[PDB]
Amino acid sequence: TQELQTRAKLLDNEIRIFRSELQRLSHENNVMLEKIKDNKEKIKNNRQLPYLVANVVEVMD
């Protein structure tokens, strides 16, 4: 009855760590996504019709 209740006090504090971590990762996701959105718009300008049509003789690679 000591060990089981001291485990409940352990599980209370665990929440704090969990909230603290979760938040950090969530703002990181938003930041990274925006950087993709700007890069995508420049790609959009070039892709805009008309464009030269060609054929690839070979890829050296």
Partner: peptide, 16 residues
């Protein structure tokens, strides 16, 4: 006709 259009110009230049 491609579901745009491929034109062929008389100088033989291809464009969508």
């Amino acid at each position: 006709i491609i579901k745009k259009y491929v034109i062929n110009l008389k100088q033989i230049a291809k464009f969508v």
